[PDB]
Write a protein that binds this ligand. Sequence first.
Ligand SMILES: [Ca+2]
Ligand SMILES: [Ca+2]
Ligand SMILES: [Ca+2]
Ligand SMILES: [Ca+2]
Length: 145
Amino acid sequence: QLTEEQIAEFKEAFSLFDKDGDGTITTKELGTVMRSLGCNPTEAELQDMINEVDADGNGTINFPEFLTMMARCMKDTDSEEEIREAFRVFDKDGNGYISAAELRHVMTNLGEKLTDEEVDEMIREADIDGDGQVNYEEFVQMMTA
Ligand SMILES: [Ca+2]
Ligand SMILES: [Ca+2]
Ligand SMILES: [Ca+2]
Ligand SMILES: [Ca+2]
């Protein structure tokens, strides 16, 4: 869901790219307009968004489709940021790896009470590359999935 204000702003930007007024823009214009609004998807993310929202695959998208993608890109951008912030919290020394000690130092300060063996298990399962710690990627793997 978008607020009244965001929809009006998005409509103004969309109309700027819809010079002919036929109510649609090309998928190329889509990326350009999204970037002007502060959304920076990778080629892959953009294309998957397109194929997923634009079921006809004909190279043009309309205003409501555009709103739906701006909504999705905003949700995704907020999640990612929420996760990064969450990461910086666990990773106390900011060296890019969450150690067992740091996971503990957090469950404690949080209020959660867990036996060290259990603190170690969260790490063990999150730890994918087997270095005994959780890097950023292994972290987002636990958060998203
Ligand atoms: Ca147009
Ligand atoms: Ca279409
Ligand atoms: Ca650390
Ligand atoms: Ca690891």
